[PDB]
Amino acid sequence: TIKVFTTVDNINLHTQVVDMSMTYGQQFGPTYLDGADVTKIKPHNSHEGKTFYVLPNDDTLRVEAFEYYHTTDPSFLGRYMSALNHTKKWKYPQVNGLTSIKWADNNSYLATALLTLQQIELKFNPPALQDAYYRARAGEAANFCALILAYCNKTVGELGDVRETMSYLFQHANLDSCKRVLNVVCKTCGQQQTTLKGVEAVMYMGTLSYEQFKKGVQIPCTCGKQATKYLVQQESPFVMMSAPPAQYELKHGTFTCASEYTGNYQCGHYKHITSKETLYCIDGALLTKSSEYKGPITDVFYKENSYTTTIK
Ligand SMILES: Cn1c(=O)c2c(ncn2C)n(C)c1=O
Ligand SMILES: [Zn+2]
């Protein structure tokens, strides 16, 4: 017999005596050793003392799992392991001071999401995610990428959407106190103010221009006229403005960073544009600098703190 540790978080370890005549799966359920699936394997003597991950299959492990990952989805950990086997083999070059990802397995959407996160102010609430995120910021991003895939219910190689991805991640970020107040004005129906909080206060779908959002965008009214919607008040460290991809000119110094999307739902590619002393296009491991940029932009990120309209 051998003594080992089992765990769901590699924080709380639990002693186990292992029967060498049974596989790990027969004793523990699906079981991983340093990420390798050992479910169908007989214990080796050399495994004595090692730490194994298992699926949360009792109350203690379930609570520990929830406390570390902030999800009760029982398939989460298996999904994470499957992703991590791949993301450990990706490469994470430093590009223009940021951790990027060299292209692999259609991962451009994860690269531009990671590049974006390093330019906006945000903290993740699940300890697993915030821990992985700080390692990713330093260049060791495999765990962070596998968690993102797991949180988004995506597998390695699946095409992804940055906006959807950002939405899921923001739901695990402390945006609780972010606030947006909007006003919609119809000459017939009058004015209707709305207040949004959390993730809905920092994401908008329909226009890339933050300035246009402040000035007012035309939206239809059920009465049949065109109403105007504009931003009354914003309280957040950034905003995300998105729209269906379309040719768009990005101007140095008017935005923080942006996502460009080429292709369709069957085959496509993201690039990342950032505004520094000039414009930089980060494309996985590739870097290109230019003073102007035009492309099929789909998300633009802007810094914010507090904004109040002067529209009376
Ligand atoms: C996979 N892939 C694409 O699919 C792609 C692209 N540029 C345009 N497209 C569509 N690049 C650079 C790419 O690596
Ligand atoms: Zn109306």
Residue numbers in the entry: 4 to 315
From the paper:
Proteolytic processing is achieved by two cysteine proteases, the papain-like protease (PLpro) and the main protease (Mpro, also known as 3CLpro). PLpro is responsible for releasing Nsp1-Nsp3 from the N-terminus of this polyprotein by recognizing the consensus sequence, LXGG. Additionally, PLpro catalyzes deubiquitination and removal of interferon stimulating gene product 15 (ISG15) from host proteins, thereby interfering with the host innate immune response. The PLpro monomer consists of an independent N-terminal ubiquitin-like (Ubl) domain (residue 1–61) and a catalytic region with a right-handed thumb–palm–fingers architecture.
Of all the trials to crystallize the wild type and mutant SARS-CoV-2 PLpro proteins, the SARS-CoV-2 PLproC111S (4–315) construct gave the best crystals, allowing a 1.9 Å resolution structure to be determined. All of the residues are visible in the electron density maps. Although gel filtration analyses indicated that PLpro is predominately monomeric in solution, PLproC111S crystallized in the space group P6522 with two polypeptides in the asymmetric unit. These two molecules (A and B) superimpose with a root mean square deviation (r.m.s.d.) of 0.65 Å for all Cα atoms. Thus, there is no overall difference between the two polypeptide structures. Locally, the angle between the N-terminal Ubl domain and the catalytic region is different in the two structures, suggesting the flexibility of the connection between two domains. Four cysteine residues at the finger-tips coordinate a zinc ion with tetrahedral geometry to constitute a zinc finger motif, which is essential for structural integrity and protease activity. The substrate-binding pocket of SARS-CoV-2 PLpro is located at the interface of the thumb and palm domains. It contains a conserved classic catalytic triad (C111–H272–D286), which adopts a consistent conformation among different PLpro proteins. Mutating C111 to serine did not induce a conformational change of the active site. In the apo structure, the aromatic ring of Y268 swings away from the pocket.
